[PDB]
Amino acid sequence: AKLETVTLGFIGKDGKQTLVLNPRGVNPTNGVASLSQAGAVPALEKRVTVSVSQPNYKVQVKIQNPTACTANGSCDPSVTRQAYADVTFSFTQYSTDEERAFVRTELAALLASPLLIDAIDQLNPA
Amino acid sequence: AKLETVTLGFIGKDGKQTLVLNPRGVNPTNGVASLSQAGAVPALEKRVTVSVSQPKNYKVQVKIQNPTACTANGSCDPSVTRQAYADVTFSFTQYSTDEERAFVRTELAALLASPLLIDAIDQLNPAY
Amino acid sequence: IVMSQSPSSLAVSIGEKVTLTCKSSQSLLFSSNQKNYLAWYQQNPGQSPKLLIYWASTRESGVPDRFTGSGSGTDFTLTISSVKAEDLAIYYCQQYFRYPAFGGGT
Amino acid sequence: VQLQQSGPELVKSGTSVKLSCKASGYSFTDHSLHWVKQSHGESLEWIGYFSPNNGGTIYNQKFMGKATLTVDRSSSTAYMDLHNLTSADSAVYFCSTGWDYGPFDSWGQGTTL
């Protein structure tokens, strides 16, 4: 599927912050695809890079989410720190459709369980 | 919070299956809490491992791992042949707020149901 | 788990926004993530019934978008985008976790 | 997927009756086979199911005495027995399949008693 403007709704604690992002090129050196939003800045925008591989298929999804800050005595803003996210899938050649779909959906749903949201939001073990 | 019997609903290609998984201990060596499904055979059961560390910056790791049973010829005990993995890591920093972390979590969760990752994973056709 | 349904039969005439209400005796948020555990079945008087809506808000392939359901903790609705020529007959509500149970009629 | 139910019977007295469900299009590896009884009119009740991952011997209450379940994996079909029958054999018994805890999707045609 060619890249299309991906829109997401009900994101965050409030479940109200919508996020719209569009493709911003395909790197030919390593075959990754990029997505970002237009924040009128070269840097301070959430970005998402997705890429599959070709042989032990490997699928990688990376998220960069930086913040902004008003630097002391600076006309321009500067990035202070950024949250990362990395996701890796490592199916094998004889993998079926149903098994891969199961892995994907399980990872997606488990990410909204009370256990894992408590693990991420308050940063505490189990 | 403490470990509990977690029942994930709305799972599968057709979106009708669901799986109940329960805790199976915590490894004291590195604090990797483990959850598993009651599959009646220890080597043929789905596994999830979640672990958050301590600092300069934090690290949250989630490893999903599930095998597929295969009936070997000439033997009655099934053996594990195909092994699907899944890795997730988050690397927030000390001074980060909590709303930002929730933003990251929910964004990655919703990205995995978008019509992009469906074709990215189910058919493995690269985004182009 | 016992299930209760709307009064036995409505007075559906034509093209109206009839909504069937099902109220549960206990919260149906068994799943860890916030997904209910109800299903809706239609049963023509002649043949075997069919599944319409499951997870209380999601359709299944082969049913027009006219049907829709709204979920809550213990009280649920089946709203239909008006009635058409053949959408009649008994409509069943089911919780289907652990111990299943049906109940009610039209 | 598709399952088939075989034959209506009209025997009298509560000695024993064999109702068989010819399952096809899947295997008992993961799916569960239910035995919902429609009774007559409304209020169709659930009887039991056979899940290899849940035990396969789960019965609804007030029915344990007059219901038995057995399934063979060679022919991929299921069949149950009724120990006694006076008026609870009012009407059709249904056979249905589905995932472990999922809903009931595909049902075969029914046979009445």
- The C-alpha atoms of residue B103 and residue A120 are separated, in whole angstroms, by 11
CB atoms closer than 10 angstroms to residue C66: 13
- Judge contact between C99 and C2, C-beta under 8 A: no
- Shared domain for B24 and B52, answered yes or no, is yes
How many angstroms separate the most distant Cα atoms in chain A? Answer: 59
Is there a contact between C48 and D109 if contact means CB atoms under 8 Å apart? Answer: yes
- Shared domain for A107 and A52, answered yes or no, is no
Choose from B45, B47, B88, B95 for mutation: most chain A CBs within 10 A.
Answer: B88
Contacts of B24 in chain A (CB under 8 A): none
Give the orientation angle of helix B99-111 with respect to helix A114-121, to 10 degrees: 140
**CATH code of residue B24:** 3.30.380.10
- The C-alpha atoms of residue C27 and residue B121 are separated, in whole angstroms, by 35
Paired tokens of A80: 């202070």
- The C-alpha atoms of residue B116 and residue D9 are separated, in whole angstroms, by 54
- The C-alpha atoms of residue C54 and residue C40 are separated, in whole angstroms, by 6
Q: Which domain holds residue C85?
A: 3-95
**Structural domains of chain B, count:** 2
Q: Which domain holds residue A100?
A: 91-121
Is there a contact between B17 and D100 if contact means CB atoms under 8 Å apart? Answer: yes
- Shared domain for A24 and A72, answered yes or no, is yes
Domain membership of residue A24 (yes or no) is yes
- Shared domain for B105 and B45, answered yes or no, is no
Domain membership of residue C75 (yes or no) is yes
- The C-alpha atoms of residue B120 and residue B36 are separated, in whole angstroms, by 27
Structural determination approach: cryo-EM
Q: Three-state SS for C27?
A: coil
Paired tokens of B27: 């490894």
Minimal Cβ distance to D104: which of C47, C96, C103: C96
Domain membership of residue A1 (yes or no) is no
Domains assigned to chain D: 14-102 (2.60.40.10)
Which of D2, D32, D1, D5 has the alpha carbon at shortest distance from D95?
D5
Minimal Cβ distance to C30: which of B7, B10, B15: B7
- Shared domain for B128 and B80, answered yes or no, is no
Beta bridge partners of A62: A49, A86
Beta bridge partners of C101: C95
- Resolution number, Å: 3.9
